[PDB]
Amino acid sequence: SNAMILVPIDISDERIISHVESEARIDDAEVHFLTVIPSLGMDELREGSETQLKEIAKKFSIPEDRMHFHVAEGSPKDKILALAKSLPADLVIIASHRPDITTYLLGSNAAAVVRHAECSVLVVR
Amino acid sequence: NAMILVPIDISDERIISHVESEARIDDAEVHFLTVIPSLPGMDELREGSETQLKEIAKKFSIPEDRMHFHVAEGSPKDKILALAKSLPADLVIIASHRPDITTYLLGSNAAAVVRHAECSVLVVR
Ligand SMILES: Nc1ncnc2c1ncn2[C@@H]1O[C@H](COP(=O)(O)OP(=O)(O)O)[C@@H](O)[C@H]1O
Ligand SMILES: Nc1ncnc2c1ncn2[C@@H]1O[C@H](COP(=O)(O)OP(=O)(O)O)[C@@H](O)[C@H]1O
């Protein structure tokens, strides 16, 4: 039962990198990157999303054999929470909001994950 | 531009040479499909199935940028046929039967695909 850290990533559009790396180093945790394709060809979108997720993950200094990639479809908050439950995650690491939006001190997904996760949550600023 | 559909049962080698050779003819896209039959979470089963599908595909000498992965849920023959139609496939490549079963010279999925597919079908022995 290695530690498992869930790292949701919005692939649309760096402070989380040092935090994920440091948290992973604590236990040599498994690091599960997740991207959610919002609802409303699917196999093609999933494939392109996985490729972009992997591109982003190259920025992180984590061993290859510790990184796992997930693509979900639907509500980002619902899927982040579902995966934190099913892994189960020992930690969720999430940015407080998108870097280019300051109106809200916590974004919606961050606020929901912080409140509803069954595990600890690190909100990164 | 050419598209080859290769259904794989992730429960249970001869098709490898044929797929590699057929793919070389045009530099075809190769679409691997596995169908998980109907009755823990569906999301985790889909991801677990895709992971095993990808491990099998590592046995095939085909360029990375030509391989595509699909997971469907239900009747294998119905989903094989649905994808062959919608891609649309120029070829389906299918083993005559499961390697370990000799009583049916042609398995039931192979028989339905070779009769109902709208494209050419290669039955491999
Ligand atoms: N589509 C998505 N897939 C995966 N994670 C996401 C997605 N959207 C948001 N998140 C997670 O939530 C974090 C904050 O996003 P959010 O709470 O929606 O605020 P904002 O709307 O400012 O981006 C993101 O940094 C990301 O970790
Ligand atoms: N669940 C499945 N998903 C994708 N392809 C399948 C599945 N089951 C069978 N096939 C395809 O059909 C081929 C032959 O299977 P089938 O006709 O069921 O014969 P058998 O009954 O001996 O397994 C398999 O090698 C595979 O290519």
Side-chain angles (χ1 to χ4, degrees), chain B residues 99-118:
Chain B
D100 56 324
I101 318 157
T102 45
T103 34
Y104 313 102
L105 290 159
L106 198 60
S108 95
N109 291 306
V113 168
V114 80
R115 173 174 309 267
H116 290 282
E118 289 174 327

Side-chain angles (χ1 to χ4, degrees), chain A residues 2-38 41-125:
Chain A
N2 198 12
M4 286 179 281
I5 302 177
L6 178 63
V7 184
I9 300 290
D10 184 340
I11 60 155
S12 316
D13 192 334
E14 308 236 313
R15 194 72 69 88
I16 75 164
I17 292 170
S18 71
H19 284 97
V20 171
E21 289 169 346
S22 298
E23 296 292 339
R25 270 192 299 267
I26 297 169
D27 288 338
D28 201 10
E30 314 288 329
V31 180
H32 292 264
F33 299 96
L34 169 64
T35 200
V36 182
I37 302 164
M42 192 50 49
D43 288 330
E44 184 158 24
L45 288 159
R46 166 172 292 268
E47 173 188 295
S49 298
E50 209 200 357
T51 301
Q52 287 175 56
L53 188 53
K54 291 183 186 175
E55 180 172 29
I56 292 173
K58 293 194 215 180
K59 297 155 93 80
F60 292 74
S61 187
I62 293 158
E64 291 310 301
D65 66 21
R66 292 297 187 274
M67 281 179 155
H68 305 273
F69 297 95
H70 303 264
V71 175
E73 192 229 284
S75 149
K77 67 188 194 308
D78 288 351
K79 297 298 177 167
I80 292 163
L81 291 166
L83 191 55
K85 196 178 277 202
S86 67
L87 283 169
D90 300 290
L91 185 58
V92 186
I93 305 179
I94 194 158
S96 58
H97 52 72
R98 255 168 91 72
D100 54 316
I101 321 157
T102 46
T103 316
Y104 314 98
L105 292 155
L106 281 184
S108 287
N109 299 308
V113 173
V114 87
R115 178 171 302 273
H116 291 285
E118 285 174 338
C119 60
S120 299
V121 174
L122 176 56
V123 174
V124 170
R125 283 185 186 95

Side-chain angles (χ1 to χ4, degrees), chain B residues 7-9 33-37 76 80 93-97 101 107-111:
Chain B
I8 302 289
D9 180 358
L33 167 71
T34 197
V35 183
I36 56 211
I80 297 167
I93 303 182
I94 193 158
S96 56
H97 52 80
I101 318 157
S108 95
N109 291 306

Side-chain angles (χ1 to χ4, degrees), chain B residues 59-96:
Chain B
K59 302 160 157 285
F60 290 74
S61 181
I62 297 162
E64 297 307 352
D65 71 356
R66 297 293 191 277
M67 287 185 289
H68 308 277
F69 295 91
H70 306 264
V71 169
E73 303 68 33
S75 165
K77 64 182 169 139
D78 286 355
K79 296 300 160 134
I80 297 167
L81 296 163
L83 190 56
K85 202 165 203 269
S86 68
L87 279 172
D90 298 299
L91 181 64
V92 183
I93 303 182
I94 193 158
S96 56

